[PDB]
Symmetry: C3
């Protein structure tokens, strides 16, 4: 349930979700830089 | 072409683009969790 | 150090950071579409 009068334009609700996209995006570049580390692992036997 | 008077501070245009970053980011973590599934596929023959 | 009166609700500071998430997210899907290209490279010897 949520109120229906406060929060005019999410002055902090839109930037609040932004921070969630800040840590989430970082986690994506994390599993990505690790995926490239596993690919080289296979290049050690596929080279 | 876009109007030049309405939309004061994108009260919904900035949060509207945010939702696009919500599904787009999810798709990134999707091709990422699948990339790790393909890496293990190679680990089955590189192990 | 930052002022403590200007910038009411980041009318352009929240959307300004959004653009940073626009190019960053693209870079994530970039290393991702390249990671899948390296995975197939291993599938050429693991197939």
């Amino acid at each position: 349930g949520s109120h229906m009068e406060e929060d005019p334009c999410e002055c902090k609700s839109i930037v609040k979700f932004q921070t969630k996209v800040e840590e989430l995006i970082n986690t994506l570049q994390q599993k990505l830089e690790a995926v490239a580390k596993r690919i080289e692992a296979l290049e050690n036997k596929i080279i």
